[PDB]
């Protein structure tokens, strides 16, 4: 298991508008509650999966808990900086397993809700 993404960087210019407050109050916490979440609120844990693989392929890793600490650090300077890494642990997800996969229909279900929240955002 590689050092897990950075959750804390002050060399970084810190925002809280009222999308990435949105983001972490509405987005995140109901994708949390999704009954197909939990494999994406921590990183992978290739030692415990027994997947040696897994960040030998996958190069910027990324999953909610790691984008929840982020949010609630202001780390982020927008709201597209936060979709991004949404957009990452989806992707990461589609380029390791195959359609059809289970984990694939997890992350499926949960980007379906994703892009129905963000879809309408903000001020
Ligand atoms: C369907 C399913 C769902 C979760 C697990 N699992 C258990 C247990 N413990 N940790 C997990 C777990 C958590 C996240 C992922 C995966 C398994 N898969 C595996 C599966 C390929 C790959 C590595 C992937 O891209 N992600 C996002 C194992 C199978």
């Given at each position: 298991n590689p050092p897990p993404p950075e959750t804390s960087n002050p060399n970084k210019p810190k925002r809280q508008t009222n999308?990435?407050?949105?983001?972490?109050?509405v987005v995140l916490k109901t994708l949390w509650k999704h009954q197909f979440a939990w494999p994406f609120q921590q990183?992978?844990?290739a030692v415990k999966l027994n997947l040696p693989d897994y960040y030998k392929i996958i190069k910027t890793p990324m999953d909610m808990?790691?984008?929840?600490?982020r949010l609630e650090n202001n780390y982020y300077?927008?709201?597209?900086?936060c979709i991004q890494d949404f957009n990452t642990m989806f992707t990461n997800c589609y380029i390791y397993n195959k359609p059809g996969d289970d984990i694939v229909?997890?992350?499926?279900?949960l980007e379906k809700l994703f892009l129905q929240k963000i879809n309408e955002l903000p001020t």
């Amino acid at each position: 298991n590689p050092p897990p993404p950075e959750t804390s960087n002050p060399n970084k210019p810190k925002r809280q508008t009222n999308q990435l407050q949105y983001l972490l109050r509405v987005v995140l916490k109901t994708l949390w509650k999704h009954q197909f979440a939990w494999p994406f609120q921590q990183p992978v844990d290739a030692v415990k999966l027994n997947l040696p693989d897994y960040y030998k392929i996958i190069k910027t890793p990324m999953d909610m808990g790691t984008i929840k600490k982020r949010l609630e650090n202001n780390y982020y300077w927008n709201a597209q900086e936060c979709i991004q890494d949404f957009n990452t642990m989806f992707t990461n997800c589609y380029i390791y397993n195959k359609p059809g996969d289970d984990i694939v229909l997890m992350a499926e279900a949960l980007e379906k809700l994703f892009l129905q929240k963000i879809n309408e955002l903000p001020t």
